[PDB]
Structures are given as structure tokens and as C-alpha cells.
Amino acid sequence: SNNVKPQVFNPDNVMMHEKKDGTLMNEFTTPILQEVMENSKIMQLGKYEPMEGTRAFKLGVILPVTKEFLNYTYSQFFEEMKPMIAEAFYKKFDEAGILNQGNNPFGKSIAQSIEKTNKVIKGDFTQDNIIDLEALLEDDELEANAFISKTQNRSLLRKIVDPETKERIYDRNSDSLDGLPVVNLKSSNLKRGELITGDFDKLIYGIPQLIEYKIDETAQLSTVKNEDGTPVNLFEQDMVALRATMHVALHIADDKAFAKLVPA
Amino acid sequence: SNNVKPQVFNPDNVMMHEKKDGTLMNEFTTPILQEVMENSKIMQLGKYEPMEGTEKKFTFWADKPGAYWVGEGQKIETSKATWVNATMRAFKLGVILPVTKEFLNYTYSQFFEEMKPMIAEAFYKKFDEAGILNQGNNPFGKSIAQSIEKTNKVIKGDFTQDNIIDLEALLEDDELEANAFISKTQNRSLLRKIVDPETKERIYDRNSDSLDGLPVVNLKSSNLKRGELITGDFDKLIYGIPQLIEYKIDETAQLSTVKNEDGTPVNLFEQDMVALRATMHVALHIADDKAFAKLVPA
Amino acid sequence: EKKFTFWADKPGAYWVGEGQKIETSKATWVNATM
Amino acid sequence: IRNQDDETRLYKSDAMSTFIIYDNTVERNSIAGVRYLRTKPIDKTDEDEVF
């Protein structure tokens, strides 16, 4: 466009070579992934279901980039970013299926299963409360398969020792509690003192369409307005965008197979 | 927003996997086409003309020199030749079919391939009804029905050996001979029940679809009424096709003619849609407005 | 029991001036059962 | 390849569509080879991107 000051976008999601203050990221050193890539927990715990068609829903995102940014600041951006989109989808799916958060489209979730069956234990972390949590499952002939926890509570788990064998019930190196593997959730919605468990073979998922990536240079982005309010034209403004889409489907075969421990 | 309900469009031309009541159309048995695909009757009867550009020029002799008896040693009078020019231009047919990605993956994977025939058929019919009947917003300033209107070369009355002979004679009154008939299949009932009282032979072949020895072509259009019949020297009807049906599928552009529920134009990329565009260039020319005649019920 | 599906609407077509906006049209089908 | 007519045949493989994955050791034995090709009709209707 004819604006010589950098283009203000609404929302400000477009990547730019020149900051609002006019700083130019020339000779810019490539970032590094100081944190490890996260992985989908319900895809780790749950049972895969061969599917076509069906109930699924579509995840998607579009990342717009200024072609000056794509030429001078960081040429390999799109290739380095595909892992990061896949992570964002995994976190969105996990948060919907487990915690019933993020405007989940399904009418099914572990949080709803637990809230329906009222299979909740009020209490602090103790060997007796861990056993009670497991017994809420074995009452209905179902045996716990794994634990889901906020990583920030290992400080509580290390303080529990079996008064018979006089040893730690929690193996901090194996990250397994009472012999069962504990998976960690990075999401902000699962609180410090909360722990979830169930026979995750009763949680079923499917993926009709794996992540699809298209890169385009001539679409219009009606969802992003120029400062003047006109929609962004990729070609006309010399800009590029990447579209990612995915389909996921979720089913819970037995909603009594999950139990939750929560602070009193 | 995270609004997961499916997008309503206006007009409702977009194909979709999900009905807005929440039904998904899995296990969809693809429709089977019953009816036969119709050919262009203009391409059947008329004369083709190779046409590279969007326009074509014709030139014909018009005047031929006289001749004089001259006495021995008299001055030989001069004479003169003359020519005339005519021209024809092309017009573009087209249509677009919009389809949602999810439909085109989970309901009808082959959908665009089974549309190409029906699009070709729709183009042919649009062309026939334009050139023959001057119907359907004829782009050309030319047509059979319009030549008939300017010449008033119309016979009034019932299908009879009398009127059909008169109809064909109306062409040789201009030194032209009829070459075929255009009729509505509804009326072969009438043609089937007319017989010569003298030779006691029928004028219409029910077996060969020949009327008075000339071939009959049937229109499927509803504009040509049962009681109406058309004839002409169809070698005088010239048509050209600068560009055969081109198909292009697009995954990225905008369709302004279809609007979202909120009134925004449909963006194919940003909405994850696919659309098929078909276009064709066709040209039509009446070489002699007098070469056509029509029989109409009184 | 038997079930059939037939094409029920043919897509329209339009005459379009030089660079005029081409309009859209839709096919349709109907279901029958025996 | 051992042909259907039971004969040993030798065919060149295009460089733009073939590559080999080698053992990481200094010996670099070839572990596995791959070939991949775009499959298309000549009418170029739609998605060229199937391999």
C-alpha cells in the first residue's frame, strides 16, 4: 500500500519486518525453541478409532505474514511454524475433551462425565485419598489406567510415603504414582491441587482429516481489517498467509470410568 | 467466536456436507441420471464456420456485368461488378458452481466430474433457445424468429398437406429450398394423422421421422408451442465456436454473487471452499433473413 | 426395501458481457424408495 | 526388479523423484530407498498434489 509508516492491522496479527516504532529486524538471528514441543494427551491416553465421516469438528487457523518479513527477517518462518500450529491444535483438542474448556463443540467431555456422576473426592493428597480416588473406579469394576496432573503438584506427591513399606508412593524419576503413569497438562485450567484418573480405554477419538496446510498469496482476509477498515488483500498488499485445518472426533463410551480429586 | 454451526448462504447455491439441522450426509448414494443429454440443435442443423477471433467478416458478389449488342465498329459500352459485406461476432456463456471442502471430501468426491455433462447440456440449450427462438435474453441482434418477424413469412392454420406444401413453397418464392423442419415433439401426434386424399400416402414418416421427405428435428424447449412448425434453408444459418467449454477449479478467489449470512462476500480460501467455473464462446449469424418460414395455429 | 436417488435440477447458465460478473447456480437431487 | 515374466530387469529411476536413506555408521549401508510420483490425468481437473 502507499502508507510508508508500517501498516497498523486490526487485529494486530500480521507479522512485520518493521516494528511500530520503526525498528527494522535486519540480520535477525533465528529464534530457538527454549521450551519443548507439547503433545496431545488425549491422543496419548485414549483409544484410536478408525473412522470416515462419523461426530467430528474442524479446527483451523490462518497465519498472515508480510513478505518483507518473509524475505529479510526470517525466510524459513512457515517451515519452523508448522510444529507450532500442530501444538496449538493438540492443546485445543486436549482442553476441549478433558476440561470442557475453550467453547468445546462436542456435548461430551471428561469434566462433564465427572460432574454428572459426581465421582469427586474432596481432600488433600494422601495415600488414603489416592487409594480412595482409585477405589471410586474399582467400585464399578473398572481399573484406573493413568493419571492426569498439573505438573506443579509433584511437590505434594513427594511428601506421601506408604506407612507399611515405609517408602515413597510416588517415583519422581519414573513420574508414576502407585505404579500408574502420570501425564502432565500445561494448560492453565487444571488447578494446582486437582488430580484426574480413569480407564482411558473408555475414551475414544478419531481423526477424519489430519492437519492440512495450504500457503496462499491471493486470498482476501475478511477477518483482518486495514487501518481504514478495508479488508486485507494478500496480493494487493504484497502479503502471504498459511491456512491450517484439521478434523477431530471425540466419544466417551462409559462416563463412569473417570474420577477426580480436588482440594477441600 | 468459536461458532460451530454451519454457514447459511444467499442464494442457497453452495453444496454442503451438513444440513443446518445437524444431519451429516455420510453414506450418500450418488444420484443416477435418468434423462438423455440433449445435443445443440443449432450445431446439428446449421453450418459451422472456423473463427479464430471474436469477429468474422464475409464478402459476397452482388452485381455482375451487363452485355451489349454492338454494331460493327461501334463503341463498346462499359459495365460494372459489385460486392457486399457482412459480419458476425461471438458471445460468452458461463456459470460457477460453489462447493464446500467438507462436502467435496465426505459426501460426493466425484461431484464436479458429474457436473461437466449437465453444464454442457445447459449451455447447448441456452444457445439453441437464443438463436432459434430469440428467447432467454438473446445477446445476438440476430435470430431465426427475428428474421421471420421482419419478413412476416408466416402461414396461419392447421397442420395439413395443403399448409405444409404452402410453407415449403414460401421459400422457393425467394429461390430457396427448404432443407429441414424444426418441431415440438408434442405435435408429431398431429403430423401422424394427415394423409393425401389422392395418392393416399402419408406425408409424415412415423418410422423415420421424415416430413415430406425432409428430416425433422425436435426441440425440448417449452417456448415452441405444439401447433407451431418452422422450416428454412438451414445452410444459410452460420454458427461459430471460438472457444470450447473451458473448466477451471479455484480454491482461493472470491465469489461476490453469493453472500454469507452476515452479508459478507464468500471468500473461498478463508472459508475453505472450492468452486468450478465453466465458460464458452459462441457466435451466430443469419446469412439470409428470407431463408426461413413459420407455420402457426390460427 | 430399495432406495433410489435421481438428479432433479440442472444447473442454469448465463450470457455474460465482457468482464461481467458470472452468476452461480445449483444442481439438486431427489430420493425415492420402494 | 524381478519382472512378471520372470526376468531380471534394470530400469533407471529419475533423480527428482528418488532418494536413499543410509545407515548412520561410518560404513553407510543403504537402509531404505524411496520413489514418489505425482499421479494425474492430463485433463488437470483438480488436485495435482496426490503422490
Side-chain angles (χ1 to χ4, degrees), chain B residues 17-288:
Chain B
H17 180 53
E18 177 173 330
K19 302 186 183 183
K20 68 165 289 184
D21 70 10
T23 306
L24 294 95
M25 294 189 68
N26 276 101
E27 308 187 324
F28 180 73
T29 297
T30 51
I32 190 64
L33 184 69
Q34 288 199 15
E35 300 175 323
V36 184
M37 169 164 66
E38 282 295 335
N39 188 17
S40 162
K41 309 307 173 178
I42 284 176
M43 289 174 59
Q44 181 169 358
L45 290 172
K47 155 175 157 48
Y48 189 70
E49 183 66 31
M51 185 186 302
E52 63 186 323
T54 66
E55 197 168 46
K56 173 83 170 199
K57 296 288 170 65
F58 302 102
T59 192
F60 311 119
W61 297 109
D63 310 323
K64 304 175 181 176
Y68 309 93
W69 308 107
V70 311
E72 175 166 316
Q74 296 292 352
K75 286 181 291 290
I76 300 163
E77 292 291 347
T78 60
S79 200
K80 183 196 180 185
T82 317
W83 62 77
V84 69
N85 297 326
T87 185
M88 76 188 293
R89 63 153 289 179
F91 285 86
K92 193 178 65 186
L93 287 165
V95 70
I96 295 164
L97 307 186
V99 176
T100 315
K101 175 66 63 55
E102 193 164 15
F103 168 88
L104 193 55
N105 287 8
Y106 303 126
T107 287
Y108 200 150
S109 179
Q110 293 288 27
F111 173 79
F112 290 134
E113 279 281 277
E114 300 202 77
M115 285 297 108
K116 287 181 189 163
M118 303 171 76
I119 292 173
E121 181 186 317
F123 284 14
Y124 296 164
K125 288 181 68 193
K126 197 77 181 189
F127 181 34
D128 293 343
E129 295 202 59
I132 305 297
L133 301 180
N134 196 42
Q135 287 294 345
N137 304 327
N138 176 15
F140 318 106
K142 300 171 172 62
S143 54
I144 292 187
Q146 195 162 25
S147 305
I148 290 156
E149 285 280 27
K150 78 171 67 164
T151 53
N152 194 32
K153 209 163 181 77
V154 174
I155 305 294
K156 286 288 188 71
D158 305 323
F159 284 11
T160 52
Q161 180 157 2
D162 185 23
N163 287 332
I164 295 162
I165 289 171
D166 284 5
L167 180 69
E168 174 168 8
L170 212 66
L171 267 67
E172 70 176 38
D173 189 51
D174 281 300
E175 207 155 37
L176 297 171
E177 76 185 353
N179 195 53
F181 291 93
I182 286 175
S183 75
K184 178 68 175 169
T185 189
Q186 293 188 335
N187 78 15
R188 55 157 57 121
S189 167
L190 298 169
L191 297 178
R192 180 261 175 280
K193 71 180 186 180
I194 170 64
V195 68
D196 179 10
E198 296 200 309
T199 63
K200 301 183 183 189
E201 185 169 44
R202 284 187 172 96
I203 192 169
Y204 174 61
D205 275 6
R206 195 180 185 176
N207 179 45
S208 76
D209 213 25
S210 308
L211 177 62
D212 200 3
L214 298 185
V216 185
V217 171
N218 295 271
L219 292 191
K220 195 174 171 66
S221 175
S222 60
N223 287 300
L224 183 63
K225 318 307 186 300
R226 158 152 49 218
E228 297 181 19
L229 174 67
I230 290 164
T231 193
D233 181 9
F234 286 87
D235 285 354
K236 304 299 186 286
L237 185 150
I238 291 170
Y239 74 98
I241 304 172
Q243 175 196 106
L244 290 161
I245 309 179
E246 288 190 21
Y247 309 104
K248 188 184 189 197
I249 284 177
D250 200 295
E251 307 186 313
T252 187
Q254 174 177 247
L255 306 180
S256 182
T257 53
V258 187
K259 291 192 159 195
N260 295 132
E261 185 177 36
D262 63 41
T264 311
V266 174
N267 295 323
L268 301 175
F269 173 69
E270 185 179 40
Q271 296 183 22
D272 190 29
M273 294 176 57
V274 189
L276 170 73
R277 186 197 74 198
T279 60
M280 185 190 188
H281 291 67
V282 67
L284 179 69
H285 185 220
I286 304 303
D288 185 349

Side-chain angles (χ1 to χ4, degrees), chain A residues 83-190:
Chain A
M84 209 171 295
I85 296 180
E87 176 176 297
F89 287 177
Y90 295 157
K91 294 167 75 105
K92 194 72 178 187
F93 182 35
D94 291 351
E95 182 158 65
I98 300 298
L99 303 172
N100 194 65
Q101 283 288 356
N103 295 324
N104 63 323
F106 317 100
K108 303 169 173 61
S109 61
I110 283 186
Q112 287 163 306
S113 299
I114 288 151
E115 185 269 350
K116 189 195 303 178
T117 59
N118 198 35
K119 203 172 282 284
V120 177
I121 300 293
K122 293 295 208 299
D124 302 341
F125 297 4
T126 76
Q127 187 195 35
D128 285 348
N129 287 350
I130 293 305
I131 289 180
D132 279 10
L133 175 69
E134 182 191 65
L136 278 180
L137 302 186
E138 286 187 54
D139 267 357
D140 299 317
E141 200 160 32
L142 295 174
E143 62 196 334
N145 191 245
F147 292 99
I148 288 170
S149 198
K150 186 62 162 172
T151 202
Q152 303 177 357
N153 64 31
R154 291 193 282 206
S155 178
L156 299 180
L157 297 174
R158 285 210 307 118
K159 296 185 179 182
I160 306 165
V161 293
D162 173 44
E164 188 185 339
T165 320
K166 297 169 292 292
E167 69 172 8
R168 304 286 157 196
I169 67 164
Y170 174 58
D171 175 348
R172 189 260 174 277
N173 186 74
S174 174
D175 210 347
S176 58
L177 179 67
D178 197 9
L180 308 181
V182 187
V183 305
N184 293 276
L185 280 176
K186 292 267 283 184
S187 67
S188 61
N189 282 303
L190 187 62

Side-chain angles (χ1 to χ4, degrees), chain D residues 23-36:
Chain D
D23 166 351
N24 200 57
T25 60
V26 66
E27 182 164 88
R28 292 216 300 236
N29 301 291
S30 46
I31 287 170
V34 297
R35 298 175 74 251
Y36 65 93

Side-chain angles (χ1 to χ4, degrees), chain A residues 52-58 62 92 102-103 105 208-209 212 214-224 234 241-243 245 247, chain B residues 1-6 17-18 22-24 26 100-102 105-106 250-254 260 264-265 267-273:
Chain A
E52 302 182 58
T54 75
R55 209 295 194 214
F57 285 97
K58 174 162 67 193
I62 307 186
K92 194 72 178 187
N103 295 324
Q209 160 186 151
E212 294 193 5
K214 184 181 176 80
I215 304 184
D216 209 318
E217 308 194 27
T218 65
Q220 172 169 312
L221 298 174
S222 184
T223 48
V224 177
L234 293 185
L242 174 148
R243 176 186 75 204
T245 56
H247 278 73
Chain B
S1 302
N2 293 107
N3 182 35
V4 294
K5 69 187 65 174
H17 180 53
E18 177 173 330
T23 306
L24 294 95
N26 276 101
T100 315
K101 175 66 63 55
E102 193 164 15
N105 287 8
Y106 303 126
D250 200 295
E251 307 186 313
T252 187
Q254 174 177 247
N260 295 132
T264 311
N267 295 323
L268 301 175
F269 173 69
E270 185 179 40
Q271 296 183 22
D272 190 29
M273 294 176 57

